[model samples]
Target: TCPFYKKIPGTGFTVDAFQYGVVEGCTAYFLTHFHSDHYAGLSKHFTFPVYCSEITGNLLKNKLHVQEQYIHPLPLDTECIVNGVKVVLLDANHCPGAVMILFYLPNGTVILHTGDFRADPSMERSLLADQKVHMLYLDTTYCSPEYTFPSQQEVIRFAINTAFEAVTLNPHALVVCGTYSIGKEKVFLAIADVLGSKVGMSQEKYKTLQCLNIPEINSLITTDMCSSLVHLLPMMQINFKGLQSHLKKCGGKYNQILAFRPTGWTHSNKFTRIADVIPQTKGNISIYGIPYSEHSSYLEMKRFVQWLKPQKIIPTVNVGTWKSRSTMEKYFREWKLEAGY
Candidate 1:
């Protein structure tokens, strides 16, 4: 198994986890974000202290109920030293509070963990672009060539326009937008701002946003679905099967229900090579698979690697049932050649 952890050979610091209790324990845990997959086994019982962006720290305490003393908040763009390793947090641009972790090892090697980020053009002028990285832990979620997409701003605009058009066509209809617990806040916030109405959210989500403490976002939460024309639901509800269940139960009150899921998977079909804002309607609900993603696409990933020029690339996820150093090394070789750098 991969053990889901990365550490310097003789160092006490860890990248993600401290699995299978060793004779030598880790001194600290570095979390990239609060996503379920990233912080899979982390719990209230986790003994090592955590270092993450301020927003992620708040979510760790408020949503996961992690203890205050165990959480250390690192501000973005600021450098700090933890256990002799120099560390700095940079905006991941994945979501609110997400950050890319940079560590300067005592051996003078610079290690970077992308921590699930979309490529931001502004990074060209940022300090990160100038660093000479020795090892890179990359996020290759959309590593295939078929997953190309436009910028997130374009997708968000398309989503907001689509929702407005749907509501205009079906005045008494319910508008639902699919989103994850921490991401896609921009979509709903834009819809609410344009529609001049509040977006409906579950109590848990409302509280999470409140804890984030963004004034613009704080003004957009609502518990009463009746107060708003647009309803922001979980990412699952935007799919055809899930939309059917939602409509059957909540469809009677409205003339129609339109839902859209903003994701990179839309291109997985067959022919999609470039980003698109196309809409597909099934049954009474219209669901769109928008090409909106926080992770970089294959081309973007390539550009990032080309820019940083790290000596070695380490994929964040391990390969299938076969996990060995040789297997991983061969995989990395093929990945570099296939990914065109």
Candidate 2:
């Protein structure tokens, strides 16, 4: 089974219980963010007290209908005690309210759960690198050498530029950008601002954006399709069939539909590469996949491990796969040999 929950020595603290397949018996539940994968089985039926950032907690209540009584919101970069365990939340920079959890165990050990974050200069300055970590739960989503993409800012810039280029070429077309429910708000907001266009989004997405309270972003969101050239859609909506369905409803007024999917999976070059844009077109719809992600790449993971120097590392991605497990072990071995640690 995937190792989602870690017992803090003799204490009653458990982090991220979805992998355990039950949240009812947990002493305390902590959510890293509002991503669906992280909150797999969590639902309206959930009754246990779930601790997370105030933004994440609000999403749970408004979007998922989780009761307010069950959600405990914590402030960022603050130290607090929960059930005798010292806990601190650091910005993960993955998405709005996404946090890297640090738990100081009663046994005088520190455990850091890097809940899906990329390597950045700020992480080195934070308390994350100040202390020796006893155990590390790493976000190893791109724990393969072939997954080297550029910095997230670079990729976002590429995406914004590519989206603009697509619209420039097809002046009468609707450009749809694919994004996770909450992660790529920056990319979408940037596109809207640069192009001077309103962004069409779902009510749920708009609600989340409103919660973020970014003045620039709040000014760009719209529910009216005719008012916006760019549509911010869920990742699933960027496919051919999804595009075609929307095209049919467009009444032939639009000449084309371009879908831009921002993901690090484009590192594989499975799509058509035009500079920074990797595109694949089918019929009247073009899907451009950009290399942008919140998780660390293989090289970034090595650097993070080298910097943190944790005594024990636990891979959080693809933990159930034997090949992934073997690869993780190989990475650890190679890193140790290279650093002589």
Candidate 3:
């Protein structure tokens, strides 16, 4: 019944595929979010009917300067038709502006493509619960058993507590939290709000926030590096070498630096406590890899699959390798069998 991995088995719609510039079967483009990896090959020159969430379209229009003529931002949870197929957008917990796309195909089969998501209780209450889903294209980024980590709420609280510790012990220390252009806003905002601090960022990054309305909107940002101790940098800047150079650029306003690198990869089954796995501090430079994941954990995905009981499941991520796809399918079979479907 399936024909291809990235393509929808011979449909004209391509989900999250700008990286190749153009796909052979593509008539219109569908984007799940504005993450760089998902929207890699998009630029000014590419012009197609790009369908995505409103915020994602705004980001594409402003951040990437993609032409507004081709951008179509769909409203959340609304069933809208595009090119003879029924489509809906369900807000995703993965990142701001992300969504789990639902398509009701002409053949009476329904497909839910989780571009990337952290499963939430609310998701089970969505429209998918009332009906049987035929195909589920899932986000299997952390599908392996050892990848389990605490919930986002737990990690967020941990980040806040850790920040309090960092600054209380050395209030003069610059607590820099790394972020992508779109994700990890909650973590930084929490730290910024509680500390009564402004965030440091390039003007370019600030514009990206303006579209989002982080939209408190302007009371919490600074161009003056010395004015803000809590700063946001690209994720790559959280490394020891990068933070070393950053400390020098602060013009001697700070004596020490505590950096935060937030992602799903930070914690797993191996850790007793999230804090125990933190790397050693180096030369007044401290980097913390907080487990602030936006993707579903293994058990989370398991529960989701069991509840949905989709007739068939598709592994969206890691499908490039036969071994990976087979492993994901194995779990699906086990879950389906256990669900007595």
Best by TM-score: 3
Specify the highest-lDDT model's number: 3
Candidate lDDT scores, in order, read 0.74, 0.78, 0.82
Global local distance difference test of model 3: 0.82
TM-score of each: 0.86, 0.89, 0.93
| Residue 228 miss distance in model 3 (angstroms) | 1.0
Worst 10-residue lDDT window, candidate 1: 1-10
Residues 90-137, candidate 1, lDDT per residue (tens digit)? 888787888888888888888888878886667666678666888888
1 versus 3: better TM-score goes to: 3
Q: What lDDT tens digits, residue by residue, belong to model 2 across residues 1-341?
A: 43444544455556666556653346887889888878876788887778999888878888888888899998887889888778999988788888889988887889898888886666888977667888888888888887766676776677778778877877888878877678766777787777788889877777877766466665788888777888877888789988888878767778898777776666365443436454788877888767667777778788878877788888777788798899888988888778866
Candidate 1 lands at a TM-score of 0.86
Model 3 clash pairs are none
- Candidate 3 per-residue C-alpha lDDT over 153-224 given as tens digits, one digit per residue, 9 for 90 to 100: 787887888788878888788888887658878888888777888887888988888777456657877766
**At residue 331, what lDDT does model 1 achieve?**
45
Q: lDDT for model 2, on a 0 to 1 scale?
A: 0.78
